[PDB]
Amino acid sequence: ASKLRAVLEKLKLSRDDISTAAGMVKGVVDHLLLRLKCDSAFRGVGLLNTGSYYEHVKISAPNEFDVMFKLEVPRIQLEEYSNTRAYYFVKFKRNPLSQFLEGEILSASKMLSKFRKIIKEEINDIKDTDVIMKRKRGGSPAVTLLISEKISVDITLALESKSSWPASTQEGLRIQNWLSAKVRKQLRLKPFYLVPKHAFQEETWRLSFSHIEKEILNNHGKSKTCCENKEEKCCRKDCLKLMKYLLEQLKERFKDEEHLDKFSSYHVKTAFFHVCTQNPQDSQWDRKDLGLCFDNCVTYFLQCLRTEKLENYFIPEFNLFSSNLIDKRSKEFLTKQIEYERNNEFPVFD
Ligand SMILES: O=c1oc2cc(O)c(O)cc2c2cc(O)c(O)cc12
Ligand SMILES: [Zn+2]
């Protein structure tokens, strides 16, 4: 459809002017890292080795950045919480970060408090940089920095574990018929991350594989040279852009009906990875079949909404569409709206 290409062109024109705000983001992040190194608890803090200071959770908000700070720690031991498959208490192999211990458990609350305090005091020194209260997110992102009242950056703290991935990830990352089993082995040799998120609960941590997700998106083809020359231009990243934008537009349209609050771009990204697994051939993502491919993604996301099943791509026992996480009527609301847009040629794209 031409409307899809027009939407993509709008998104690219919106993206070209960032190369100036990205420098500001890099400066502020570098400053806060050099500050956090001075603390006795955060000596090994840094940015995820993702080749970018930042990511973008929202494609329709080029002003909202998302950075993640990793903290290399002594050998970590993990305990599962209530068979959640994703949430864990952290212990230390043996006796630095000792100040944040609450018994045998590493306190997420205490560490986040010191993190935020260090932020507040080091941002009072900067210029046009205000800290705001976004603790309604359940510890992650930890902070939400504000520059010139037009730049918003969410900062999430993450613990790096160079151990083997937890057992819940054993049947995840099913990229064997798509990106090969060698690549899956290589990726699972990389470390994993733990972010402070609660379940009621007040001291749990959740698994994070944003680096692996970024690696997959930027190396997404069966052919190693996908999207490296003009003869192999597939439309996977364009379909993902279309899915993110559809969700963002629907969430902005119905921001006053609290039925689309708990949906995020992580859901469409998870579904999209599953569709990639289902459609492993690059020929199934020809740049000429953009409409058909996007329609495959939309219909698969609808299937996940109706059946209330959206497995985490790395932890398949974690149902992101769990009745414990999102109510059935909210899923049904999103299903109706997506069916409406699909039956009416997506009026949100006009
Ligand atoms: O790493 C993320 O993991 C998740 C896991 C979940 O189960 C979930 O429901 C949401 C997320 C999620 C949502 C975001 O907006 C984001 O920027 C990152 C993540
Ligand atoms: Zn490609």
From Swiss-Prot:
Positions annotated to bind 2',3'-cGAMP: 66, 154, 197, 206
Marked site positions, Important for preferential detection of curved long DNA: 26, 34
Effect of residue 120 to E: Strongly reduced nucleotidyltransferase activity. Abolished nucleotidyltransferase activity
Residues bearing the modification 5-glutamyl polyglutamate: 121
Effect of residue 163 to A: Slightly decreased interaction with histones H2A and H2B
Residues of the full protein shown: 162 to 520 of 522
Binding site for Zn(2+): 220, 226-227, 234
Protein name, as recorded: Cyclic GMP-AMP synthase
Cofactor(s) the record lists: Mg(2+); Mn(2+); Zn(2+)
